[PDB]
Amino acid sequence: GSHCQKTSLRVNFEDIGWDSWIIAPKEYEAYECKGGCFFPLADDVTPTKHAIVQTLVHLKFPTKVGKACCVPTKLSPISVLYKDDMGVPTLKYHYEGMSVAECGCR
Amino acid sequence: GSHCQKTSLRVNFEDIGWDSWIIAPKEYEAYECKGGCFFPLADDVTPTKHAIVQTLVHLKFPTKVGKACCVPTKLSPISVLYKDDMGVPTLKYHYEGMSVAECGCR
Ligand SMILES: [Cl-]
Ligand SMILES: [Cl-]
Ligand SMILES: [Cl-]
Ligand SMILES: [Cl-]
Ligand SMILES: [Cl-]
Ligand SMILES: [Cl-]
Ligand SMILES: [Cl-]
Ligand SMILES: [Cl-]
Ligand SMILES: [Cl-]
Ligand SMILES: [Cl-]
Ligand SMILES: [Cl-]
Ligand SMILES: [Cl-]
Ligand SMILES: [Cl-]
Ligand SMILES: [Cl-]
Ligand SMILES: [Cl-]
Ligand SMILES: [Cl-]
Ligand SMILES: [Cl-]
Ligand SMILES: [Cl-]
Ligand SMILES: [Cl-]
Ligand SMILES: [Cl-]
Ligand code: NA
Ligand code: NA
Ligand code: NA
Ligand code: NA
Ligand code: NA
Ligand code: NA
Ligand code: NA
Ligand code: NA
Ligand code: NA
Ligand code: NA
């Protein structure tokens, strides 16, 4: 059963060019949503009625319409230490939207 | 500029097998979210910080991590006429989650 679920994803801030403004941490666990959104669906998928409808339309017209996407449906914050406008390392206690809390088909 | 946006999608309830319980309408405009989530991003995309991070990670590791997905970020209801448990056609005035209101990268 390869369905929509949260899997691990470690993000190094240098690799994505954010080290120019983020002192710490060097890496963090962001997670990612992976898997398909096909029938039969799972319970923790929590699909919208449109995702269900679009998945049905994709089954009968695969070349015209795409299927639903396994995406983050809830995010969690992290803390980052960033240089202030005058170079002062400053804590951003709740840097929102950075880590996956829940996945779902949309 | 092929970015994330709402495009037309007409859904025939018979084609998806929902005519067994939906008398009317026969078809409805559900819309769909289509387009890529790549940089440079648009203003009406409203991307989360994780979608931006994942897109950056996908650029440097295309085979390991996928990119962000253009998905519905707000849905609108429709009205449907459905047969009751005793065959009585009944109006569902606000059948929620059926039509796309806004698209975005997630
Ligand atoms: Cl299965
Ligand atoms: Cl199902
Ligand atoms: Cl929902
Ligand atoms: Cl297919
Ligand atoms: Cl397609
Ligand atoms: Cl969110
Ligand atoms: Cl706290
Ligand atoms: Cl904060
Ligand atoms: Cl923030
Ligand atoms: Cl965010
Ligand atoms: Cl462009
Ligand atoms: Cl951008
Ligand atoms: Cl947001
Ligand atoms: Cl690519
Ligand atoms: Cl992949
Ligand atoms: Cl939604
Ligand atoms: Cl009304
Ligand atoms: Cl209602
Ligand atoms: Cl409803
Ligand atoms: Cl819904
Ligand atoms: Na087709
Ligand atoms: Na997907
Ligand atoms: Na999200
Ligand atoms: Na939170
Ligand atoms: Na958020
Ligand atoms: Na790679
Ligand atoms: Na997409
Ligand atoms: Na949605
Ligand atoms: Na509404
Ligand atoms: Na909804």
Where are the domains positioned within chain B? 5-105
The two counts, helices (H) then strands (E), for chain A are: 1, 7
Give the list of residues 6+ apart from residue A12 with CB closer than 8 angstroms, or none.
A26, A27
Tally the C-alpha atoms within 13 A of residue B59's C-alpha that lie toward its C-beta.
12
Residue of B nearest to A105 (CA): B71
Query: Residue B87 and residue B95: Cα distance in Å, rounded?
Result: 19
Q: How far apart are CA A21 and CA A17, in angstroms?
A: 9
Q: Do the Cβ atoms of B26 and A75 come closer than 8 Å?
A: no
DSSP B42: P
Q: How far apart (Å, rounded) are the C-alpha atoms in residues B71 and B34? A: 8
* Residue of chain B minimizing CA distance to A10: B57
- Cβ atoms of B77 and A48 within 8 Å: the answer is no
Superfamily of domain B5-105: Cystine-knot cytokines (2.10.90.10)
Q: B4 to chain A: which residues are within 8 Å by CB?
A: none
Among the partner residues B17, B57, B72, nearest to A16 by beta-carbon distance? B57
Q: What is the DSSP letter of B12?
A: E
CA gap B30, B93 in Å, rounded = 16
CB atoms within 10 A of CB B11: 22
CA distance B54 to B61: 10
- Reference B81, options B2, B38, B12, B24; nearest CA is B24
SS3 A75: strand
Question: What is the experimental method?
Answer: X-ray
Q: How far is B98 from chain A (nearest CA, A)?
A: 5
Can you give the three-state secondary structure of B76-104, one letter per residue? EEEEEEEECCCCCEEEEEEEEEEEEEEEE
CA A64 to CA A73: how far, in whole Å? Answer: 26
Question: What residues does B63 pair with on adjacent strands?
Answer: none
How far apart are alpha carbons B85 and B101 in whole angstroms? 31
